């Protein structure tokens, strides 16, 4: 079996920059039998390059391929925000058909601070006996952000979960939601609910908060 090793595993570069992806085969693969795919989140892979160097239908000029034998290259000459995706190399010069493990390409945009919003649990959810408090960090970069929950000045631990959107295809930003989950009994016996956010875009951490009975 022909093993395809892709390098690098992850790549972060700005728009306008040149991106070069590598795919190494464990055995010789004839040039005409290597393809590249682009896969964006929630979508099927799309054929980019076939036969090492031929562009597929509707594929922009900035994508190009080259290589022979055991070393193959996909190049994006000038990165665009929409080029955020995972890229896969694939051979069928020999059975069975194999894929590389993929190169995740991130677009390295300029620093963008989050807009922080806090949401109290609705009245309807309280009926079930559980309270979810939601902190939203909207449209920021880079991905790394620290979200700390504070209940009446008490720094919470192990009672929240985080979720991050896939990098936006237009502005290259991320969004993050943090959900603090507590029982209705625990929620209604406290007053100040705060979400503190530490991020590169912010000169100082930002705290959004609300009072339960306000």
């Amino acid at each position: 079996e022909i093993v395809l090793t892709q390098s690098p595993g992850t790549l972060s570069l700005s728009p306008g920059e040149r991106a070069t992806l590598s795919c190494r085969a464990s055995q010789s693969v004839s040039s005409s039998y290597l393809a590249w795919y682009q896969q964006k989140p929630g979508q099927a892979p799309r054929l980019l390059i076939y036969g090492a160097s031929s562009r597929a239908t509707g594929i922009p000029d900035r994508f190009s391929g080259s290589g022979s034998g055991t070393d193959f290259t996909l190049t994006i000459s000038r990165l665009e925000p929409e080029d955020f995706a995972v890229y896969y190399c694939q051979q069928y010069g020999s059975s069975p058909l194999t894929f590389g493990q993929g190169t995740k390409v991130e677009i390295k945009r300029t620093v963008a601070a989050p807009s922080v919003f806090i949401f109290p649990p609705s009245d309807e959810q309280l009926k079930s006996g559980t309270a979810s408090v939601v902190c939203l960090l909207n449209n920021f970069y880079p991905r790394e952000a620290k979200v700390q929950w504070k209940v009446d000045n008490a720094l919470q631990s192990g009672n929240s979960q985080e979720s991050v959107t896939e990098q936006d295809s237009k502005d290259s930003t991320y969004s993050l939601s943090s959900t603090l989950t507590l029982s209705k009994a625990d929620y209604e016996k406290h007053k100040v609910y705060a979400c503190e956010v530490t991020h590169q875009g912010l000169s100082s951490p930002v705290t959004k908060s609300f009072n339960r009975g306000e």
Partner: protein, 211 residues
């Protein structure tokens, strides 16, 4: 134009069986080399099976003896009949056209999620995230399995919408939020309704979000 429309995905018990369909438009499945490709959550692409134009079939070692690829010429449809399913078979499954010479896959179906689990289907509880640039959303809580689809105002509002990837809670059920930012000058006049659809449990909930 060329089209590949997939159906058949969803929840099935381990040891169970399930058939996926791939209906073609703009070309014939009978005269083409056809393929199934799967992708486990967060993983890479794995080739499942192929059917040649002349009918010859080949299978990945991991599916041999369990899976059958076939086609119905008059319905112009490709099938994958799966058996003895395990958690390792949980994946988005893609049908794909590829030319016989070099096996590059030039046209792909949209994919369909197969979740192999013994856990029961549960519909989501949809709670509002009221504003008080205004952020407002819906909390889609306690459901199984993936996926849920969220639209806003029946798909009329798409600008500024963030539907978050679902998180697995310690209970074994999923939860996500869907948020949208809007001008606060429109909170009085404009109605904002999130449409949460969970097909595995036939749950279809419309939820009005108000100040």
């Amino acid at each position: 134009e060329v089209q590949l429309v997939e159906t058949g995905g969803g929840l099935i018990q381990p040891g169970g069986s399930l058939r996926l369909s791939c209906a073609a438009s703009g070309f014939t499945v009978s005269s083409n080399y056809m393929s199934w490709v799967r992708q486990a959550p967060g993983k890479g692409l794995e080739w499942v099976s192929v059917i040649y134009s002349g009918g010859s079939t080949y299978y990945a070692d991991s599916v041999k003896g369990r899976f059958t690829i076939s086609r119905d010429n008059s319905k112009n449809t490709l099938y994958l009949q799966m058996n003895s399913l395990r958690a390792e078979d949980t994946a988005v499954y893609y049908c794909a056209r590829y030319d016989g010479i070099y096996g590059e896959l030039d046209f792909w179906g949209q994919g369909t999620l197969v979740t192999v689990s013994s856990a029961s289907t549960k519909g989501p509880s949809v709670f509002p995230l009221a504003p008080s640039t205004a952020a407002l959303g819906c909390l889609v809580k306690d459901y199984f399995p993936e996926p849920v689809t969220v639209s806003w105002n029946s798909g009329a509002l798409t600008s500024g919408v963030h539907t978050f990837p679902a998180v697995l809670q310690s209970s074994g059920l999923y939860s996500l939020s869907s948020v949208v930012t809007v001008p606060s000058s429109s909170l009085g006049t404009q109605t904002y309704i999130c449409n949460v659809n969970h097909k595995p449990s036939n749950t279809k909930v419309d939820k009005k979000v108000e100040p």
